[PDB]
Amino acid sequence: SAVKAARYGKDNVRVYKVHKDEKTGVQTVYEMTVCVLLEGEIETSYTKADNSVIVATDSIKNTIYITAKQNPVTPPELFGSILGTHFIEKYNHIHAAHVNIVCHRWTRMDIDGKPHPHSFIRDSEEKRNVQVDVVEGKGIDIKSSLSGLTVLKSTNSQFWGFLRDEYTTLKETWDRILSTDVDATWQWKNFSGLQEVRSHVPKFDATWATAREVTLKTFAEDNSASVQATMYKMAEQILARQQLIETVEYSLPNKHYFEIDLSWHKGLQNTGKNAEVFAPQSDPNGLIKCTVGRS
Amino acid sequence: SAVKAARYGKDNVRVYKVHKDEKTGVQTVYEMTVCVLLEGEIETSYTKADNSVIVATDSIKNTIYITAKQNPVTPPELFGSILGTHFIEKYNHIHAAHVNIVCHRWTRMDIDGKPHPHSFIRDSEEKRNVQVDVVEGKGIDIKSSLSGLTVLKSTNSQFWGFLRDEYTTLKETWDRILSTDVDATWQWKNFSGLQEVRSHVPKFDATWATAREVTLKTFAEDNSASVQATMYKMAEQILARQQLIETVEYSLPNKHYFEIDLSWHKGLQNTGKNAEVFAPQSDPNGLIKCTVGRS
Amino acid sequence: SAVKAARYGKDNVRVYKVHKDEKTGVQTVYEMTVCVLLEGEIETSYTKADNSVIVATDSIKNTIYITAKQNPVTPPELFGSILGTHFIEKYNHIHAAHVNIVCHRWTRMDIDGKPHPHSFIRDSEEKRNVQVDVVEGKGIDIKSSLSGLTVLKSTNSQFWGFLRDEYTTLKETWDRILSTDVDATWQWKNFSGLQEVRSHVPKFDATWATAREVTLKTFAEDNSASVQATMYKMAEQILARQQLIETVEYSLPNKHYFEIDLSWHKGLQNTGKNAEVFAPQSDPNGLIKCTVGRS
Amino acid sequence: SAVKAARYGKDNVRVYKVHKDEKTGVQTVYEMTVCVLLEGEIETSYTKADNSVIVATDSIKNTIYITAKQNPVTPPELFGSILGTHFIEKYNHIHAAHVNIVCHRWTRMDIDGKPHPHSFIRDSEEKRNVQVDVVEGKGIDIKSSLSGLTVLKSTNSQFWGFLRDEYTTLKETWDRILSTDVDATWQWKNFSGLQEVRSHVPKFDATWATAREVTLKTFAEDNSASVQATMYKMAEQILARQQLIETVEYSLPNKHYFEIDLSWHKGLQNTGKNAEVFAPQSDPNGLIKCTVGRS
Numbered sequence A, B, C, D: 001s002a003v004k005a006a007r008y009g010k011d012n013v014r015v016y017k018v019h020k021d022e023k024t025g026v027q028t029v030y031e032m033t034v035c036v037l038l039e040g041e042i043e044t045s046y047t048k049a050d051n052s053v054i055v056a057t058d059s060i061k062n063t064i065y066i067t068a069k070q071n072p073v074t075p076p077e078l079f080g081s082i083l084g085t086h087f088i089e090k091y092n093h094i095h096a097a098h099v100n101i102v103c104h105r106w107t108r109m110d111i112d113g114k115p116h117p118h119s120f121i122r123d124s125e126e127k128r129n130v131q132v133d134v135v136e137g138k139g140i141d142i143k144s145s146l147s148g149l150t151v152l153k154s155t156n157s158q159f160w161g162f163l164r165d166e167y168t169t170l171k172e173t174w175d176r177i178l179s180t181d182v183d184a185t186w187q188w189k190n191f192s193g194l195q196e197v198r199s200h201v202p203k204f205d206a207t208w209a210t211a212r213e214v215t216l217k218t219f220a221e222d223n224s225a226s227v228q229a230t231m232y233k234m235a236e237q238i239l240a241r242q243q244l245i246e247t248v249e250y251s252l253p254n255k256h257y258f259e260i261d262l263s264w265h266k267g268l269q270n271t272g273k274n275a276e277v278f279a280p281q282s283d284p285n286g287l288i289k290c291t292v293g294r295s
């Protein structure tokens, strides 16, 4: 037998950092969960019990905190690139670092109409994520994403004209509820190294904001023919607005809300045009994916 | 042996209801999870296999949907009272109904500065809850709550002056992070029945809004001496603002964020006044509770 | 306003302890999650910011580890009683301690037919729990439980003869699936203090074993008329087998598995006597409770 | 823009099936959660709102139940292959089906020493999984796995001899706790189609059993130099025992249990040779992966 692939590191490293403005007294907090996995010339730790090649996962943990102390943690695309580059430069036998960061929301509180200097609220479990792969001699590949953005529209979704055969019971509809948890990922063109990532720093937050805005507006305004058709419209717009993105991927569950026929009870009318009360279904769910790139 | 207590019913009943304004085209959605448990002269279903006394839990499920079809589902204090009253009036041998409702957030989307007529976002897993106990001949007891409101302040929390003995290692501090998930419950004076609940309908939403506002403002503005001291200030204010509340209960975890000493690495300074990077602790956590009533 | 009730302490304290037999080389591990909440003359920490009355929750955490170091951690009824008694005896102004322990399974591995000396498997998320309330001058109240015991029987469950009215759609049945997650609690007679708890130590493990065995055998062998009727049979037997128990409480969800009518597809027969494929329902679920005591 | 990749289908489809032996009265249950995602000539549903190419996800759901009715659901490698083949053969424009099955444990109860005919227990959340990719003209690729197998050994794990530099604080050790949740995947050689999968049916259960046995025995008996070294020993043995496997992949968290220094309290000794009470750490955790193949 032979080792075909190997990677190891530290997962679930929670990190908080505060920035304090001395002039204004305003504080800003960042909280993330970080995973770092390394690859390189480490096969002998597996095959020969040779620990000499292992940067201990505990040391990887220390490195994450030290790196956060000495560098900006925002945008996460930059922090992840700094962190991955550290490992491939510091250790001769480590040739790739894979950094995943999940950013948690701490949104500044408004008290009596004004922004509070040091108090924050978690408004939703929506996350902003990055996956950064730093590979020696092959540059830096960054995939940015938002996830856990849960939305619902109560009308202006349709689904008709699909294939009907002996396995089909679903009725065509011209008016249904559409609800989903949005997972959207935009993949950046390869960067040559950290200097190039630094050169594009302002584009990261702006592109996240664009992706989020296009997602919400398209969802709200599209008279949706299907999840497929609506998601493609989102992806097309993001690609149009940022030239440095190569592909956009969406993964959307279709979280079903079923009509409840109550006609058995005193002829009560609660279907079609009369539908007011619905039963949200926890499972199963549709799952629709697409990756959109450039012609 | 004898049956000392018994209750049974349906849990985890998900319900969605849409309201459609014909004039304006505006739609408003409500989504809840409902539990209804009944008590009464039902001992023989347990002791003698006498199912004749059982209102099937499936029928309880049907009743929840029918009731939501025929009645307002907001405020949840009212809906829960209607639902509980139904069971004690309809069935001679059922003498108490216990209704728990969890309300999920569907907040209207703002697109391009304006409120969208039929699109919604789940902004946070914060819930608004009610527990309604409808007991034949003893009226209606309602406990209203908010839960899952997660907040953090990065300074203006202290903790010193506590008992020190041979079990104590904690250092006194004049500046720490304070973060919690707020669970707050206000208990209404007993209502004589549904007519009385109806008479107070406007107070329910207003008191929820007050409770939330007092919680956020007090948390943000108090230079906190302890979780104990800050929570008492919250409770005192809520009681002052609504005469029909008898008690307020808070249950607050203290979600610890630890300093990280980095001095072992190149004398890096990251403690006390120099603390910038912290380690959020998943467990253990402080848990602090208090029930405040009137003198 | 006044403080009507208050308790505070440390939750989610994970503890592991190993016992090593020097003669045999056999090791035995215990893992628990512990919560300790204190009550007493502590109102002024809430009302006056007087921290002098607060045993810091961090110190409570230290005390749990020290107590586990110096005492047996099994049976958990004993450990919880030692731990609660410590707080009321050590601190003059603390008058009640409430200790909750969840015990996690680490079952010795069998390798090649023999028990391994130091390797363990988590066979299921079933837990054994205790709640111990130690109240100065009122002794020690212990509630022991098992929870998360998930079972299913594929036949020999019936449900017919229930109330039918205009809210009823459920069909009577003489053969259904019954599946539940068992939560069973037995409440001990009050103990005068630690000496009395010590005197009954062997009864704790034996009664847990009895409760578990009676639950499984009754579930498997009863031709169940309802969840109500089967659960009562369990409780009756436990009370008969241990005189020192005052009450037994069961809380059982009815986890529904629905028939799937496939007759629309080529007349396929999959209902009643022909039912082979079913759809497990995640929600809603029946919830049935009863507390059984002595005549 | 262009569609670069697309797949869609139904996730989280819960399925239960019972087999009833008429001669013996013995019943056997199977419960699974199934996901099926399709690919093919479906781009126009995304780009042109052309639903004519869409096999509705609801129909995919129906197909799963019908297929379970008409075919064995065990071993899951076979069921997944039947299910995936159905879609590529039935629909001309569908060219790949991706089937994921999670099998849940329902283990026959032993009552009074004998196996019960129709009662089952969920002994642990360990799962047996398959991923089956059926691709038109390219055969059937099957990855089988076990996951959620949680184990701990209290001694006979070491970790010393790792790289030490200015980022390192971890002390070398010759005796520690090792605990993990095992995720192990074996990838079968490509099969030409369903006839070939059928020809190997007995190997599926036998190889799962082997993988599980080798995992448990190696974990228990290895005097572990590292997670890396122990996991490689597992993989090597599985490959040796089944020629039709091409690669074995393990992904193992290192779930840390920390010593607790209690020496500050009355000189209490609880470290090194005196360590009895430990603090399980929920996070962070090491994560160690390797894929082993044939020379």
Ligand SMILES: O=c1[nH]c(=O)c2nn[nH]c2[nH]1
Residues within 6 Å of the ligand: A008, A054, A055, A056, A057, A058, D159, D170, D225, D226, D227, D228, D254, D286
């Ligand atoms: O078994 C281990 N492998 C590792 O790579 C490691 N790093 N810290 N502790 C460790 N233990």
Ligand SMILES: O=c1[nH]c(=O)c2nn[nH]c2[nH]1
Residues within 6 Å of the ligand: B008, B054, B055, B056, B057, B058, C159, C170, C225, C226, C227, C228, C254, C286
């Ligand atoms: O065992 C049952 N008990 C009940 O109360 C019930 N209600 N619906 N189905 C039921 N099954």
Ligand SMILES: O=c1[nH]c(=O)c2nn[nH]c2[nH]1
Residues within 6 Å of the ligand: B159, B170, B225, B226, B227, B228, B254, B286, C008, C054, C055, C056, C057, C058
């Ligand atoms: O606010 C606090 N209250 C407490 O009771 C406590 N105990 N440790 N830290 C604490 N912080």
Ligand SMILES: O=c1[nH]c(=O)c2nn[nH]c2[nH]1
Residues within 6 Å of the ligand: A159, A170, A225, A226, A227, A228, A254, A286, D008, D054, D055, D056, D057, D058
């Ligand atoms: O938007 C949808 N897309 C689909 O593929 C589908 N299948 N069933 N319902 C559906 N809705």
Ligand code: NA
Residues within 6 Å of the ligand: A087, A088, A089, A090, A091, A092, A093, A094, A095, A136
């Ligand atoms: Na390198």
Ligand code: NA
Residues within 6 Å of the ligand: B087, B088, B089, B090, B091, B092, B093, B094, B095, B136
């Ligand atoms: Na009544």
Ligand code: NA
Residues within 6 Å of the ligand: C087, C088, C089, C090, C091, C092, C093, C094, C095, C136
């Ligand atoms: Na005392």
Ligand code: NA
Residues within 6 Å of the ligand: D087, D088, D089, D090, D091, D092, D093, D094, D095, D136
């Ligand atoms: Na095909």
